[PDB]
């Protein structure tokens, strides 16, 4: 299982990815995601973070 996401995670992951991830680099690699794992507003990893994005958010 890849953890779970709630309504707060959607607002935290979005507000964060929309503020920094705005080019073909922060969302293509694993920097903006791993960087959040070191100092994120909520409690989550970077894998499920970037995985849920391409899973059914950006595309």
UniProtKB/Swiss-Prot annotation:
What's in the misc comment field?
A: Shares a bidirectional promoter with KARS1.
Q: Which gene encodes it?
A: TERF2IP
PTM Phosphoserine: list the residues: 23, 25
Domain of life from the UniProt record: Eukaryota
The part of the entire sequence present here spans 132 to 190 of 399
Biological role: Acts both as a regulator of telomere function and as a transcription regulator. Involved in the regulation of telomere length and protection as a component of the shelterin complex (telosome). In contrast to other components of the shelterin complex, it is dispensible for telomere capping and does not participate in the protection of telomeres against non-homologous end-joining (NHEJ)-mediated repair. Instead, it is required to negatively regulate telomere recombination and is essential for repressing homology-directed repair (HDR), which can affect telomere length.
- Tissue specificity statement from the Swiss-Prot or TrEMBL entry: Ubiquitous. Highly expressed.
**Subcellular location, record wording:** Nucleus; Cytoplasm; Chromosome; Chromosome, Telomere
Domain (Myb-like) ranges: 1-57
Family under the similarity heading: Belongs to the RAP1 family.
Origin species: Homo sapiens (Human)
Q: What is this protein called?
A: Telomeric repeat-binding factor 2-interacting protein 1
Q: How does it assemble?
A: Associates with the I-kappa-B-kinase (IKK) core complex, composed of CHUK, IKBKB and IKBKG. Homodimer. Component of the shelterin complex (telosome) composed of TERF1, TERF2, TINF2, TERF2IP ACD and POT1. Interacts with TERF2; the interaction is direct. Does not interact with TERF1. Interacts with SLX4/BTBD12.
């Amino acid at each position: 299982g890849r953890i779970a996401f709630t309504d707060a995670d959607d607002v935290a992951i979005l507000t964060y990815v929309k503020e920094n991830a705005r080019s073909p680099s922060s969302v293509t690699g694993n920097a903006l995601w791993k960087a959040m794992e070191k100092s994120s507003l909520t409690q989550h990893s970077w894998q499920s973070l970037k995985d849920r994005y391409l899973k059914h958010l950006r595309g």
